[PDB]
Design an enzyme around this catalytic site. Structure first.
Site, short mmCIF file in Angstrom:
data_model
loop_
_atom_site.label_atom_id
_atom_site.label_comp_id
_atom_site.label_asym_id
_atom_site.label_seq_id
_atom_site.Cartn_x
_atom_site.Cartn_y
_atom_site.Cartn_z
N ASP B 143 0.82 -1.10 0.43
CA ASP B 143 -0.09 0.33 0.27
C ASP B 143 0.78 1.46 -0.04
OD1 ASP B 143 -2.21 1.65 -0.46
OD2 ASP B 143 -2.69 1.67 2.28
N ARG B 147 -0.16 8.99 1.50
CA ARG B 147 -0.55 9.17 2.62
C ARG B 147 0.63 8.22 4.12
NH1 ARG B 147 -3.81 5.95 -0.96
NH2 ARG B 147 -4.21 4.11 -0.57
N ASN B 148 1.14 7.09 3.35
CA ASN B 148 1.88 5.81 4.02
C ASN B 148 3.97 6.84 4.05
OD1 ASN B 148 -0.07 4.23 5.05
ND2 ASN B 148 -0.17 3.79 2.89
N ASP B 161 3.78 1.72 8.14
CA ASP B 161 3.01 0.97 7.38
C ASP B 161 3.57 -0.23 7.19
OD1 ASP B 161 1.81 1.95 9.44
OD2 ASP B 161 -0.58 2.52 8.31
#
Lengths: 278, 272
Positions: B143, B147-148, B161
């Site tokens: 992912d 955003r990560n 993450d």
């Protein structure tokens, strides 16, 4: 049945009907005395209704009232007596603008930046004339701009009969696109069509030009488009498009119709930019 | 893990040496709070603490432990959120990691719509490096998105993450970062991460743009099948766009590796 109009009538034997263009067929008009002219001929299909007949007549009558302009598909004549109604209009050998732009994208000769801005200018001029003649297009898009052998942009379908209160919002174009993607929010949501809503559409067309036949909101369905519009979403600036031309697009997309530039203004601005474009 | 978790002296931090602070975020059954750690010897370090929510289950505990263990196996790198310690004994498990004061990359970018063209390429370089490291450590993120990627007070990009244990769950849709094989053939590899990185590159050059706005899952599937690729953002060189297009190659084996991407990005940053 049809009333005679000496102003536009051409004898049927002067029209050599040819290859179907899209019912529209390419033809050769002898005279219009010893010279043939390639022209486009609009006619009804075999299963056409009286309503279909009326709509074709209305479009022709509308074209007569509107008059001629270099940047619109002009009426050339008609065959209305003893036989199928033939509405003879100008022929654009290089097809619609979307197709024309796509065929010239780099891996047919590439269009220069001046070529692109000039394309926009001609369209704005066609529209400026149409608005001056009190005509609201209602479906201004690159698909509705045809290109002649000499690369002249001509607005098409400006006199088309259409019931707005019966438009199928989920219906796609032949190319599989959703026409609602060119509509001003007030035309889409409130069914209010004006020269102002045509300007919004022109903003989308500008975007199409600078993306070389790009498809607005790819993968976005009707319902999602409504949401984007309600939220005030505006498409991103195409690469290889100046901030000036993007600002123009954004101005065409002003939420307030009264605040959008007029085609008259757009013509002046584009005339300025073309001259300054490399 | 019902009554006590295994002990690991190497990472254990006494609870008295940690003062929990303001929450930084809540997830499914996880909670993250800002905290001040002392002597990670009398100095306090602002850190982020991952813990379970009061409604978590044993499986959630297992997931938080697996993540901590993965961080241990993976090791340290400047461009990834690193493990600093853990309170595993006598009370709730606290996984103490590095704190990133400037939030995620998406928000960082939008709040500055002010980075220079070199800054933007530098951002991409740092992310690719973090990824090259994770990939060398056999870690597949699955992912990777802006955003990560978290940003520290010193503007360091750090992949987040990466050790974590419904296509319609949003308000963006993560499927929009997924490689076709991963989305269609449930095949996750380091190369599927590369595709995601291409979308991340796009995010960087649009300063936090939303990929495929208004495009629902079903429509995306169709766009993917049609071989549709996002347009080149304005203020993006054809080179950087080709890199994106490279990352978006239909054949995973034809996509560049993160090692390649790092080499190229190293080069481009210099020429920017």
């Amino acid at each position: 049945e049809l009333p005679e109009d000496p102003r536009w009538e051409l004898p049927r034997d002067r029209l050599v009907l040819g290859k179907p263009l899209g019912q529209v067929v390419l033809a050769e008009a002898i005279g219009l005395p010893n010279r043939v002219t390639k022209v486009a001929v609009k006619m009804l299909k075999s299963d056409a209704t009286e309503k279909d007949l009326s709509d074709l007549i209305s479009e022709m009558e509308m074209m007569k009232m509107i008059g001629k302009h270099k940047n619109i598909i002009n009426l050339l004549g008609a065959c209305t007596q003893d036989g199928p109604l033939y509405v003879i209009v100008e022929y654009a050998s290089k097809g619609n603008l979307r197709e024309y732009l796509q065929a010239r994208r780099p891996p047919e000769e590439q269009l220069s930046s001046k070529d692109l801005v000039s394309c926009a200018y001609q369209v704005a001029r066609g529209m400026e004339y149409l608005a001056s003649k009190k005509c609201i297009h209602r479906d201004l898009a690159a698909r509705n701009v045809l290109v002649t052998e000499d690369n002249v942009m001509k607005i098409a379908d400006f006199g088309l009969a259409r019931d707005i209160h019966h438009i199928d919002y989920y219906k796609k174009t032949t190319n599989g696109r959703l026409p609602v993607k060119w509509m001003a929010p007030e035309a889409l949501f409130d069914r209010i069509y004006t020269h102002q809503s045509d300007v919004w559409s022109f903003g989308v067309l500008l975007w199409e030009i600078f993306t070389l036949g790009g498809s607005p909101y790819p993968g976005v369905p009707v319902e999602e488009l409504f949401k984007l519009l309600k939220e005030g979403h505006r498409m991103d600036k195409p690469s290889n498009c100046t901030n000036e031309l993007y600002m123009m697009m954004r101005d065409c997309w002003h939420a307030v119709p009264s605040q959008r530039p007029t085609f008259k203004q757009l013509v002046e601005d584009l005339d300025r930019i073309v001259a300054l474009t490399s």
